[PDB]
A paper describes a structure:
RV is a non-enveloped double-stranded RNA (dsRNA) virus with three concentric capsid layers encapsidating eleven dsRNA segments.
The structure of the neonate-specific P [name]* has not been determined previously. To examine whether the [name]* structure of P differs from that of other HRV genotypes including P, P, P, and P, and whether it can bind glycans as observed in P and P, we first determined the crystal structure of [name]* of a neonate-specific P HRV strain [name] at 2.0 Å resolution. The residue R187 involved in direct hydrogen bonds with Gal of LNT in P [name]* is replaced by T184 in P [name]*. These observations indicate that the neonate-specific P [name]* cannot bind LNT at the same site as P [name]* and likely has a distinct site for type I glycan binding.
Residue numbers in the entry: 65 to 223
Write the structure that this text describes.
Amino acid sequence: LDGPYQSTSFKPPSDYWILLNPTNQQVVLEGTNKTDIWVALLLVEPNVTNQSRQYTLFGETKQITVENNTNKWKFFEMFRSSVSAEFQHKRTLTSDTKLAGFLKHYNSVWTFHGETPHATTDYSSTSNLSEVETTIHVEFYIIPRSQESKCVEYINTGL
């Protein structure tokens, strides 16, 4: 919808879907309010044998075991609620579209999980939504939640 945005660090306005358009395996998003929510989406290329890859998350060097036995791409949703904790593999988006989503809405942070073309949304709660800031490493678009059905379309079948 709103055309290609270059990679940047910003606090997205609420009720707007950020639609990430990555090309290469990567840490594609880091989002936190530095209080009770840390979210990171790691893009894993197709046909990846179980192995521990090194990622930089919020200035910290982390080893994360990744695996992708499919021809599709997988977005690893790493999550922690306290800065002192280690990241957990909370959800996964298995995709042939290579698009992912990020939305701030009603005290929660919404992402997509499942497998295309049947990927669905889920959320994580936070006590300070307004202060969650995202470092989008890749090109992205912005779609309002008043057109969320369009963003579901793109997530599952592409732009």
